[PDB]
């Protein structure tokens with residue numbers, strides 16, 4: 001697989017450090033739609049609104065199985081560590097037009 005999961009379930013956003021790599025979700029947008037990171041970087045998504053959101057990498061992107069992240073409520077967060085160089089599209093399961101990309105160098 002091309003990523004690992006620090007926490008299988010969402011956790012409180014308050015636990016994320018200032019300066020951690022963070023993608024906010026708000027107004028139906030991933031606030032960094034094309035994120036550039038390095039191999040071994042841990043990316044954390046944080047939902048800032050009441051509409052629940054997840055991240056969903058389809059089969060073939062991070063492995064042979066889809067990675068369907070858990071739904072995050074407001075002020076919940078979810079992380080992935082990218083372990084292999086590449087480019088990875090993802091979207092929100094319920095809202096396929098809310099989508100983004102992680103570029104791992």
Ligand SMILES: [Cl-]
Pocket residue numbers: 066
């Ligand atoms: Cl499926």
Ligand SMILES: [Cu+2]
Pocket residue numbers: 052053054092093094095098
């Ligand atoms: Cu969503």
Ligand SMILES: [Zn+2]
Pocket residue numbers: 094
């Ligand atoms: Zn909905």
